[PDB]
Write a protein that binds this DNA or RNA. Structure first.
Ligand SMILES: [Mg+2]
Ligand SMILES: [Mg+2]
Ligand SMILES: [Mg+2]
Ligand SMILES: [Mg+2]
Ligand SMILES: [Mg+2]
Ligand SMILES: [Mg+2]
Ligand SMILES: [Mg+2]
Ligand SMILES: [Mg+2]
Ligand SMILES: [Mg+2]
Ligand SMILES: [Mg+2]
Ligand SMILES: [Mg+2]
Ligand SMILES: [Mg+2]
Ligand SMILES: [Mg+2]
Ligand SMILES: [Mg+2]
Ligand SMILES: [Mg+2]
Ligand SMILES: [Mg+2]
Ligand SMILES: [Mg+2]
Ligand SMILES: [Mg+2]
Ligand SMILES: [Mg+2]
Ligand SMILES: [Mg+2]
Ligand SMILES: [Mg+2]
Ligand SMILES: [Mg+2]
Ligand SMILES: [Mg+2]
Ligand SMILES: [Mg+2]
Ligand SMILES: [Mg+2]
Lengths: 121, 120, 209, 56, 114
RNA sequence: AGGACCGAACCGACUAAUGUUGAAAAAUUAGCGGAUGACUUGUGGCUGGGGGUGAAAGGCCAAUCAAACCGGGAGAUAGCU
RNA sequence: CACAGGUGGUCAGGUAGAGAAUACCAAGGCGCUUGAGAGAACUCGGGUGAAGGAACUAGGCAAAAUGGUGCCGUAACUUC
RNA sequence: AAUUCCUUGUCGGGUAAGUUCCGACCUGCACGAAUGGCGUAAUGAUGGCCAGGCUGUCUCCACCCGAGACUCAGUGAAAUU
RNA sequence: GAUGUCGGCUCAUCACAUCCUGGGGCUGAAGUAGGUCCCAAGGGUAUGGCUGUUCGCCAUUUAAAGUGGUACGCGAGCUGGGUUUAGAACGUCGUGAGACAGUUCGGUCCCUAUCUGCCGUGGGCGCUGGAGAACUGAGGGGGGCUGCUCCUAGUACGAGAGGACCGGAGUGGACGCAUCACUGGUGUUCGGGUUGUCAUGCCAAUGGCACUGCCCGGUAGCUAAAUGCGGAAGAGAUAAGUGCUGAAAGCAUCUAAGCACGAAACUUGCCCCGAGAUGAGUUCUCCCUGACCCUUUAAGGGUCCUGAAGGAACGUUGAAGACGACGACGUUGAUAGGCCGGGUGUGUAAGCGCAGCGAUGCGUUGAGCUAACCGGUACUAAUGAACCGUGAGGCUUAACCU
């Protein structure tokens, strides 16, 4: 969601705060939410984990505050933005487990690996 | 643009338009006639009529509330008692306007707010 | 084909048995009795003037009721042409209804407009607000540099700069049709058409594909 | 900003073209009295549309 | 207006039971899923509330797996389907946006009990 | 106790906006610095111009200062406009 | 100038308060010598803002923030 | 370096990226010992850099309350030409 | 006897030596992608870190991050960081006053717009009798972007790796327009909580002031982050290029005779303005057909009576609006206000009753209150007049005619 914007990690390894240094998807692309690809920059990381601080990879937004409305109009909004890191060059998640509930927006046959984890929606 | 916005602000805080209208409405309930400004009347209009309507019914309930607006615990008597049952049948046109306008100092257009039943 | 003159008064949902909520402006077309036909040998083209409402038979000027009575009189808001071709209609108010846009899915909807009036850039031209702070004297939100200099000398026309914003045809094109429910002069579009209720709209099949 | 040249008395008038005044499109007289009063409001003595409001 | 309202109530449902800004409820909506059509439950706690004829919302706080979710249902939507009430509570407020940043204990909403 | 601390009166003047034919030939507003001290203020007195005064900027010496104001030499001189 | 500036001393009520701060009041004195409408851009002074949160900019300028008493507790360094 | 021209020196730290900043090197164009050298707790409306909080500073403006602006009545300027 | 410097902001406009996209030739062009040249200016053409920068380097994007003109576009539009005032210090030079195409910290940015020019919006008159309309459309402007995915086709091509053309389909980024139904924001005119204090004699209940005192939530309206739609297809004539048939020139040749294709350019198609289009256009409808004089008589001037269609005026007002303008309504009425009922929003009034020593709780009650909203209603206000505009509309010719 726009440059900066500190979002939590919905997956393990390289936990805590991580900054979005870019919104991929075209020129002037203002903000990003629902389930878009975002250029992240690990700003916290865990002592061990798999990805240490300073790292600049990519991630997918899993939860936003502006929620996500569907047909009927009803919207679904979580409290606190969150994303999930993933291999830079060829997409797909880096972590193994995904914390917190997700959204049916990721049911895309390209993010399946995530919605297939415990949580919800 | 004010598109579809009701209410006149005359020219002062939402405070003035709570006193220069309260002291007026109460001043109207008294003499039943006034030579105020046309606008300062067409507005005062939907200030007393509501009170009069509220005056149709007695009860400490629709009394103290009537005391809220118009702090004049005196004119409240004029209401419920005098012009209270007076218009206890009118549809709401408890007020007349009688235009005339044009004051001395300011070319401001005055009027003549008056209870529909003032003539004797 | 030709279109009909309606009256804005919509904006409401219409959920589907699938689980989707469809927006829509409720245009009302209460018959459009053709008040006059225009010939190319008598006039110069192929059109069909119509009406929909009915004045209080009071404001109707004789010159008005004179044109109505001349044909299928019945008063009405105003007169509306409808350039047509390769197919005419019975001169006298043949009466055309919403059932016209039956096997139709185009529609355009041509209301009046918004009505801002005030104008001023940043709103009528989506300009950019200058430095809200960091100095900036009496220039937070203003035009700023309209021309160039001596070489140009003047100020090219069209130069975006404030000016009345509102009241002006502005169509829409497209807008999938929902229901042409007649017997109540009702027609529903996809949503968001000009005007502000009680407005005169000219709904017709989209000239575009 | 100022005028680089002194506006001719001619131009001056052109501006005062729409500065002229207007009449009154004729007023009105009451029914209860020959009251030569202004259209739509109180006569010189409490009268108006017939009747008579405000004493004296 | 006159055409509408009637054209609106023409869609409105009557399966909508009693409510309150403190109630718990358990809305059961559709899901579709892959080749399914299952009904997904959503037991929460009403904070805000509809009241606009056909056009109506719910706004229900839940706090799922660790993080808190908030859904603004559209009462008269085919996807809404069933909608229980579970536990009714006393709030004394129209909107419980204050019930936001709270969490256990600090959130505890005293039941209604008539 | 203290050229001590926080802070009104009181003294001052770091910041921004507004004012810039001002309300005002330096202010108003919101912040700001000192506030028992080389403090601050009333009243009266003494320093006079190449002279004074100066915790020193050429600063101040009556909205004037790298030599005050008034009068005189004086119609200075002006190969310049 | 019937000028939002300057001008030394004296008196010092009530409620709340550390108080000559501040807020509401008393005694007392006032509404500032153009007014009536309207409810445009725009300028001035303010209030509230979805998500983000210094990406602004020469610079976080301006804003927003912090703010009380009691108690707990408080680092490098130190001329203690 | 308030001193370095070459200069954004070179290296390290901080950043996703740092012509600034901090720690170094020494090749000091052109430091250096009361026109003091190097340190220094405390103090500072002092210069530079960083961060947490905070936010309309900004993405990108939206609405709202007031004083003008606009209309009417009375008074009635200005520079310039 | 003054033409304000650099950079930034804002807002632009043009050129083409074109960055992307579109069309072609050659290739050391297998495909995919390139290299270079020709054509093309419709549209589009990055956010940050460092620095005053422009630029540049760096990070990360994009279809691409074009070059240049415009007083190195733009301070009577913004800034004032760089840079030239006065303070001060360092290195440096000079005995020194001071000095530097070195540095360093600090350092007042005026103008109410007459004329042209623009953006909007009215008033006159003219269009040949006067009106109310509906159009025609000469012209003018707006818009003209593009990613990815799939199908084609894992095909053509290729040793494989990889991987098209043409054509079709879906969903995005950026931009524009409209609109509040939704999701939200605002909502000092709605409801509630609460601190200090004053007051209404006191209890209770209320109101004033303290940023709306502070604050919670919110109707209409307005809005974007919300929602819907658009940059097209199709034609015309082409650019570069490609060609047919074809001699001058026995062949050859796209050209000389003569035909055919061909791009985001150009004409048009789509949206809006538009008859002051003085070259003032067309069609439909409505109104007026009473009398005299002076004559310098081919025209007038004037008189009495008449004042139509329509217009304007005044008043009630509007999602219209700076004022004018535009729309609705004016008792043959819902045009405003009030009123009635509902809605909505707040959140269970006051009084009484009971429980508790009391704060307070429970009941009455889900009340009480309730703006711009909806349905409806003449209670109030929208007077009968009057006002302006007239009285059959020039001449010549042609077509029709008794
Ligand atoms: Mg200034
Ligand atoms: Mg010229
Ligand atoms: Mg001290
Ligand atoms: Mg001050
Ligand atoms: Mg102090
Ligand atoms: Mg003295
Ligand atoms: Mg002096
Ligand atoms: Mg001499
Ligand atoms: Mg002389
Ligand atoms: Mg005075
Ligand atoms: Mg915000
Ligand atoms: Mg920055
Ligand atoms: Mg920047
Ligand atoms: Mg500050
Ligand atoms: Mg503040
Ligand atoms: Mg260093
Ligand atoms: Mg030295
Ligand atoms: Mg005047
Ligand atoms: Mg070229
Ligand atoms: Mg850059
Ligand atoms: Mg930084
Ligand atoms: Mg320049
Ligand atoms: Mg200026
Ligand atoms: Mg500077
Ligand atoms: Mg107040």
């Amino acid at each position: 969601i726009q440059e900066q914007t500190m979002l939590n990690v919905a997956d393990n390894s390289g936990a805590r705060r991580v900054m979005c240094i870019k919104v991929l998807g075209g020129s002037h692309r203002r903000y990003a939410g629902v389930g878009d690809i975002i250029k992240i920059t690990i700003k916290e990381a865990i002592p061990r984990g798999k990805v240490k601080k300073g790292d600049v990879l990519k991630a997918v937004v899993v939860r936003t505050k502006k929620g996500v409305r569907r047909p009927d109009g009803s919207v679904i909004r979580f409290d606190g933005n969150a994303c999930v890191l993933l291999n830079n060059n060829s997409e797909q998640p880096i972590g193994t487990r995904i914390f917190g509930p997700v959204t049916r927006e990721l049911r895309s046959e390209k993010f399946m690996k995530i919605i297939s984890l415990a949580p919800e929606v | 643009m004010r598109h579809r916005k009701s209410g006149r602000q005359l020219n002062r805080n939402s405070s003035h338009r709570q006193a220069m209208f309260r002291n007026m409405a109460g001043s109207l309930v008294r003499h039943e006639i006034i030579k105020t400004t046309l606008p300062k009347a067409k507005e005062l209009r939907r200030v007393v009529e509501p009170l009069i309507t509220l005056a149709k019914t007695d009860s400490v309930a629709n009394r103290r509330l009537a005391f809220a607006r118009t702090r004049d615990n005196e004119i409240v008597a004029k209401l419920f008692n005098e012009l209270g049952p007076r218009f206890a049948s009118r549809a709401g046109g408890y007020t007349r306007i009688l235009k005339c306008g044009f004051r001395a100092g300011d070319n401001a257009p005055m009027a003549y707010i008056e209870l529909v039943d003032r003539s004797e | 084909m030709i279109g009909l003159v309606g009256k804005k008064v919509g904006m409401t949902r219409i959920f589907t048995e699938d689980g989707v909520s469809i927006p829509v402006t409720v245009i009302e077309v209460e018959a459009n009795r053709v008040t006059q036909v225009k010939d190319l040998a008598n006039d110069g083209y192929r059109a069909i003037q119509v009406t929909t409402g009915a004045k209080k038979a009071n404001r109707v000027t004789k010159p008005e009721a004179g044109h109505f009575a001349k044909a299928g009189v019945e008063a009405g808001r105003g007169l509306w042409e409808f350039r047509l071709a390769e197919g005419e209609e019975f001169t006298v108010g043949q009466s055309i209804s919403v059932e016209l846009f039956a096997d139709v899915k185009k529609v355009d909807v041509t209301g009046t407009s918004k009505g801002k009036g005030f104008a001023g850039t940043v709103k009528r031209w989506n300009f950019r607000t200058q430095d809200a702070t960091h100095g900036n004297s009496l220039s937070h939100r203003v035009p700023g540099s309209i021309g160039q200099n001596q070489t140009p000398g003047k100020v090219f026309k069209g130069k975006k700069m404030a000016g009345q914003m509102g009241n002006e045809r502005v169509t829409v094109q497209s807008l999938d049709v929902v229901r042409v429910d007649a017997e109540r002069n009702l027609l529903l579009v996809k949503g968001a058409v000009p005007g502000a209720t009680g407005s005169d709209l000219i709904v017709k099949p989209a000239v575009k594909a | 900003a100022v005028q680089q040249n002194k506006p001719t008395r001619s131009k001056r008038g052109m501006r005062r073209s729409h500065d002229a005044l207007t009449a009154v499109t004729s007023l009105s007289v009451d029914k209860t009295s020959g009251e030569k009063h202004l259209r739509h409001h109180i006569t010189a003595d409490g009268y108006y549309r017939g009747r008579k409001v405000i004493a004296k | 207006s006159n055409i509408i309202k009637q054209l609106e109530q023409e869609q409105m449902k009557q399966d909508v039971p009693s409510f309150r800004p403190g109630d718990t409820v358990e809305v059961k909506v559709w899901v579709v899923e892959g080749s399914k059509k299952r009904l997904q439950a959503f037991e929460g706690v009403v904070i805000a509330i509809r009241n606009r004829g056909l056009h109506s919302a719910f706004t229900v706080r839940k706090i799922s797996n660790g993080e808190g979710v908030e859904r603004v249902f559209q009462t008269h939507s085919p996807v809404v389907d069933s909608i229980s009430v579970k536990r009714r509570g006393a709030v004394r407020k129209a909107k419980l946006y204050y019930l936001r940043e709270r969490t256990g204990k600090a959130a505890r909403i005293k039941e209604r009990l008539n």
